[PDB]
């Protein structure tokens, strides 16, 4: 499923991401835009052989099991394919773990390079929230 911007914002807010660990909602929408273009089925292979999955491009090296990243962990205790669902529950619950781990949203390279330090509230402007 390819979400609309405000559709995704509302879904994220219902699932508790607004101001989660101090990150206002527009940070999360900005990160989803540049990680996956709001597409829950996005996948991208990394040079080490791990894969990024779903709307927030969560990496199989640490966070989910895809059966083909030897040596990796599964810290969100989920098959990576769950992160591709049209229901973003699994992606959000796993993101809450990632952002809690000490590096904050710097875990998402696109957030650091394209969202951090910008006017992120722009991403939720016009939405009924």
Residues 88-107 that bind Cl ion (CB under 5 A): 104
List, in sequence order, every beta strand (DSSP E) within the chain. Answer: 43-45, 51-53, 58-59
Among 11, 24, 43, 93, binds Cl ion (CB under 5 A): 24
Site residue total, Cl ion (CB under 5 A): 7
Among 60, 84, 92, 110, binds Na ion (CB under 5 A): 60
Place of tokens 């835009």: 33
72 near Na ion, judged by CB under 5 A: yes
Distances (CA, A) of 6 to 50, 67, 71, 107: 31, 34, 38, 24
Other Cβ atoms within 10 Å of 57 Cβ, number:
21
Instruction: Output the smallest distance, CB 121 to Na ion, in A.
Output: 34
119 is in an annotated binding site: no
Cα separation, 71 vs 93, whole angstroms: 23
7 is known as an active-site residue: no
52 is known as an active-site residue: yes
List residues near Cl ion by CB under 5 A: 24-26, 69, 104, 114, 121
Residue positions in the annotated binding site?
101
Catalytically active residues, by annotation? 35, 52
């Amino acid at each position: 499923k390819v979400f609309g911007r405000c559709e995704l914002a509302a879904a994220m807010k219902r699932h508790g991401l607004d101001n989660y660990r101090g990150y206002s909602l527009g940070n999360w929408v900005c990160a989803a835009k540049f990680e996956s273009n709001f597409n829950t089925q996005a996948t991208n292979r990394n040079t080490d052989g791990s894969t990024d999955y779903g709307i927030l491009q969560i990496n199989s090296r640490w966070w989910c099991n895809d059966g083909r990243t030897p040596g990796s962990r599964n810290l969100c205790n989920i098959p990576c394919s769950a992160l591709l669902s049209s229901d973003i529950t699994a992606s959000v619950n796993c993101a809450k773990k990632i952002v809690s781990d000490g590096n904050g949203m710097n875990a998402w390279v696109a957030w650091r390079n394209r969202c951090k330090g910008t006017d992120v509230q722009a991403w939720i402007r016009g939405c009924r929230l």
